[PDB]
Symmetry: D5
Subunit: 152 residues, 10 copies
């Protein structure tokens, strides 16, 4: 059985990307954004075609991402930030709701939203993953933007 | 090097209209949160004539109250205050989960940012230690996100 | 000094119409909750001719019953009663989670406040210790939130 | 004392139309549930010519099947049967959670009561001990909630 | 009691199937896809009626499956991939959200979506389940496509 | 192939001296265990005049009583009976852990085998289902290990 | 089968009891001690044969009980106090170590030690159990002192 | 560069005397473990005339049996076999913890190495997947540690 | 019923106290020791009668405390330090074993050992508790030293 | 101000004799630990002619080996190296707990300090990240505690 397999497309030329960065544990999101923007340029995304906004924390990602997607000016969005466990169930609540809103936005608007929100126990874990997750989200935004076009 | 447009955060509260719903379970906690919240709003330049404060019995009632205030579209941003403090039963998880989920749902479905200032902690001492800080935080979240929602409309 | 408008809570039940859905699983518990609830509503000034009480097998059936009562808009506020008591399986988590989630959803989507009086406890004794208190609590939540919904309605 | 109107439960199945979706994973369990369920329905007065039974591979497929049967509005109430038995992985939580959540969502959005008869247990023995009881329970739930939904319309 | 029992139908002739393969832990999804396609052919599905696309990870399944389903080019969909626990709560988040989106799409569009995303602690667990889960999802997609047809007015 | 000496288990109770300490917390359970235990001992050939039965308030008191009976060396093997049923607190873990650990320590330090028949369950129903079986099991364990300890001396 | 059954003996006349009361959450241990002493008197224990000492917390019970037991001035000992969960794993550590030491002392010295240390999540749980646990420990100390005598050559 | 004395592992079983205690709960598992164990010992050069095998009802009885065999000092090393498979209760934790603790204690207090081949798993399939491997592993542990105890004995 | 109740005695005059401080998360044990020594002086303990030693981490407390107790030069010992959860089960192992050894030493030698080893999830929790636990352990060492005398 | 005698840590390894037992399960990990450990010992001044290194199959075998080396009293301090990496079963807890407990018991009962360098981690990546550091740490622990044991003898 040899069906049609759509080959992934990582060509960023012409894409419009939005990025919302939660600033809680700011050093983490900044490292993610530096890696993220850098990778987007590598993929061919124009610097003039990227908007970056920031919010206080991960629970504010939903409302900001929702607007940018509902504008339909963007082929794909990226959510950045870090939830680091402290002393309370607040970690579970934030991790759960921020990810759930990122899922909901992509389903209801058709705009892919790369989920680059870390959910980790320690500062060191977030530092170890920051740059990697940032560049990954750049590749997710580009690829899924192109995949959404093929399916419209 | 990549130099895109970065929208600078705007913490100017002049002219903003804020609604606040305070869950009263563990009342000393929410009262401290509201005292810190109102004070910080003033520091940010929000007029006291432009702030409405209502209260509900507990965190599970935040959803229905916040839903009305948002759907009226009289408010640029909302704030939820309160404290879920673990006792002896899975009720702690249920309340923490559902109140936070409704705060999330309201912001997404109406476009009105809702700062989530409901604590979810194991002990009274944890709630006391975080009350004032979380109140002031919610002041800066409401103001900042109110401006961001306008800038993206 | 910042002094905003503070809407004062209103616990006057005169004229309110309240619906109550009582899950019958662990029936002794819900019956005790309902006895405390009705008594407190009367104390708050709710007319007994303005209270409707229905019952369902268990907490997972509360969603559909409450959903109908709210969508009729005959009620100013609703109350959910019952008890999920942990046994031997993850069924406890499932029931606790889903019944509370439906109570939340109904209030959000219809604007009708729904007091959540469904206990989620490990033992019969915990449910007995909490039954009457939670019942009266739900009475005060229904009255207060019914009035708050009025104050915020166009 | 306070004496309001108490709607007494009605377990008369005469004339009701019932749909049943049986998940077949751990087939011995769902089959045993269905035997108890159909028997109880008959005892309650439900006509066999007014009952439809379909089956799906597992509990995660219950949502889509139940969604159609409810949206057809040929049925006064539906019943979901099956068993999620913990193995070695978080897959147990995933299936338990989603199947139950979908059963909830269908009942809320269509008004058709859906009895949740999907067991969520750690061992085969737990499922066997609960099969027949849960089947008959779901029969009584479908009838009662079908009549209650009628009384509120 | 002998009611109407709709018999399962595993005839894939004429069915149109979409497959979204998450590539995180790529060896797993590849083994799932080989097993899946092989089983579909065994059931009589034409290769000219199957589309396969891939996404980086399980959190991208939602948006991809959503478009394919809303196009109504497909009688049923299949999600493949593997979430393997590492060091952080990210495992729970991904397992939870990917499964919830697969559930949501099937409910809101009526298109069955076979959930073939593994949620396991170790690579060895994923390797042991890969092929089996791929073929299972083939049988689920075919069966549910036929069940959806039987229930479409 | 490799064929070593395999000591075959010996379940002949003739002539053995058995001690039994019955914890009385959740008395219905331990009483039911003891009825099954004494019966099985008789079936195995143990003389009733060679069995001693004592009882203590709860599982945490088993250690000191069993310690004396073993240190007297009047008994070839001992049996501990009782039931720890989870309630509302970490007390369940504490009792389960210490009673079992003491049963282990006594057998190691004195050489007298101690059958552990203390259930550690979440619910009364679990204890009831396991009572008789665990009683007879402990009877077979006492006899077998008594004979094995003799064979090694 | 009718074996020799040593009947429990709750006659406290002539028994010598030592009591070590941990003072952390002092209200709890005080209520336990009032209930405990009252019950001992009811059982016939002379007040001139009871010694009560106190330590700061449950981790100091071990060394105090150890000395009193090794003196062999006491027929049985009683440990009172309460570990109430706060914000950290310290709760498990204290509950675990205090109970393990109470177990170890009784095994190594032969002196029964009633474990009356509560291990609970909340102050309310400790208050609800305090008096009951105090009286229970009285009955355990008396009964086990008599049982130890019956088993002493 | 630091080069100390490294004692090389010694897997020669010639002349060793091995004892094996097999818990029979979930009997198919322990039987499979023992088949793999005996086979590997033979491969390592252990004489079958120098191996003793006894069995106990369950893992909680391993302590007392192993204790006697070690205290006799007829054995250079011992092996514990069996499987604790989680069911419905905390009994799984208790048995897993106590059987391993006794295996540790016996080796520490007597100097006789005791290979721990008691599985502690959630499902029958996990135990089947691990049975033979763990059996052969325990054979190599018994031989190797028997020789290491000799190299460190006065 | 009015039995003999031994009244607690917090008079430190003449007592000999040993202190073993685990240095992992050093700032914590130092704050504990500053509060601890200060309280001992308040209770009447001679500065010339206190020995303070330190070990790398909490798992080394057992062997050091064991020697000092087996010398029988000390009326009571104090263990200080902090186990702060990171990313692994190492937290449970260290918390469990360090506390278990502190219990074992006191039982087998008769020398009370105040357990001042924190077992917490975050640096902030340890900072909040350091001084309190230090002074508490001083009062535990004094009181239990005096209690051991009455029972010899 | 209180100025007592503070014994200064002594990290001078000249003349010390160290034994090392390396568990070989996940061999790459223990090998890296030993490479870092030996190097740091040299930095501290320990003669290579005064170090013995042996290896065992896994962490559960560390106890019996370490016990001999300590009881010979040829060594001023010991070091245990290895890695317990969680897989699919409660075996991870058992091994982590028992090996650490034996390392503790040996040091207490023989007086020979034993640095515990056995990792207990969820993933291979965690073990790799900590190997070299933990090896060097154990070098400084062995040296420092060897000197402390002498100073207190
Ligand atoms: O608390 N920890 C975190 C956090 N809290 C703030 C939260 O997102 C929100 O801003 C407030 O609740 C106000 O709405 N936000 C994060 O992004 N990461 C964390 O680790
Ligand atoms: O119970 N604990 C809490 C709580 N329970 C009440 C609940 O929110 C609701 O008011 C009732 O169930 C009635 O609907 N509400 C809180 O805000 N914090 C708590 O800590
Ligand atoms: O099982 N325990 C409980 C329970 N089970 C039944 C469930 O709510 C429902 O009736 C069935 O799933 C049928 O749909 N219902 C409760 O209210 N409390 C419990 O403690
Ligand atoms: O795995 N265990 C179970 C299960 N898995 C299959 C799942 O429901 C679904 O059919 C597949 O993911 C395909 O979409 N389904 C059950 O009903 N019970 C179980 O115990
Ligand atoms: O990290 N582990 C996994 C994972 N992470 C990536 C995630 O799904 C998503 O693609 C990114 O967050 C970008 O949005 N995705 C998986 O499918 N399986 C895993 O095991
Ligand atoms: O509490 N639950 C239980 C229990 N508590 C009492 C305990 O064993 C002891 O008797 C007291 O602490 C007095 O020393 N004892 C049991 O055998 N089973 C239980 O389920
Ligand atoms: O912290 N909580 C508790 C506690 N801490 C003190 C501890 O027992 C000990 O006295 C000190 O660590 C000094 O050695 N002691 C208790 O009896 N109950 C608690 O609930
Ligand atoms: O129950 N499960 C198991 C078990 N129970 C019996 C126990 O070891 C002992 O025989 C009795 O307590 C009698 O003393 N024994 C095992 O080896 N594996 C199990 O999985
Ligand atoms: O790792 N975390 C901690 C820790 N690790 C080191 C350990 O005590 C010991 O020194 C080594 O295992 C070497 O023997 N020690 C602490 O006192 N607190 C911690 O939080
Ligand atoms: O299984 N995982 C591990 C392990 N198992 C083997 C065990 O220590 C012992 O050798 C056998 O049970 C035989 O006695 N040993 C380790 O050092 N690390 C692991 O991660
Ligand atoms: Cl790619
Ligand atoms: Cl926090
Ligand atoms: Cl990484
Ligand atoms: Cl800012
Ligand atoms: Cl509570
Ligand atoms: Cl809304
Ligand atoms: Cl939206
Ligand atoms: Cl803080
Ligand atoms: Cl009020
Ligand atoms: Cl159950
Ligand atoms: Cl209460
Ligand atoms: Cl009925
Ligand atoms: Cl599984
Ligand atoms: Cl929704
Ligand atoms: Cl609805
Ligand atoms: Cl049952
Ligand atoms: Cl089939
Ligand atoms: Cl729907
Ligand atoms: Cl047999
Ligand atoms: Cl309890
Ligand atoms: Cl011991
Ligand atoms: Cl021994
Ligand atoms: Cl059973
Ligand atoms: Cl009695
Ligand atoms: Cl003993
Ligand atoms: Cl080898
Ligand atoms: Cl079980
Ligand atoms: Cl394997
Ligand atoms: Cl005091
Ligand atoms: Cl760590
Ligand atoms: Cl504090
Ligand atoms: Cl140093
Ligand atoms: Cl494993
Ligand atoms: Cl030893
Ligand atoms: Cl010692
Ligand atoms: Cl690190």
């Amino acid at each position: 059985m040899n069906p049609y397999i759509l080959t992934p497309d990582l060509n960023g030329e012409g894409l419009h990307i939005g990025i919302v960065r939660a600033r809680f544990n700011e050093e983490i999101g900044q490292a993610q954004l530096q890696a993220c923007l850098e990778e987007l340029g590598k993929l061919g995304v124009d610097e003039r075609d990227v908007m970056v906004v920031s919010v206080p924390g991960a629970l504010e990602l939903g409302v900001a991402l929702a607007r940018m997607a509902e504008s339909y000016e963007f082929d794909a969005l990226i959510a950045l930030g870090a939830v680091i466990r402290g002393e309370t169930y607040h970690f579970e609540v934030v991790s759960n709701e921020s990810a759930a809103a990122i899922s909901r936005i992509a389903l209801e608007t058709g705009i892919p939203v790369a989920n680059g929100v870390l959910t980790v126990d320690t500062d060191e874990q977030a530092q170890a993953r920051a740059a990697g997750k940032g560049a990954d989200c750049a590749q997710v935004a580009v690829e899924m933007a192109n995949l959404a076009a093929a399916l419209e």
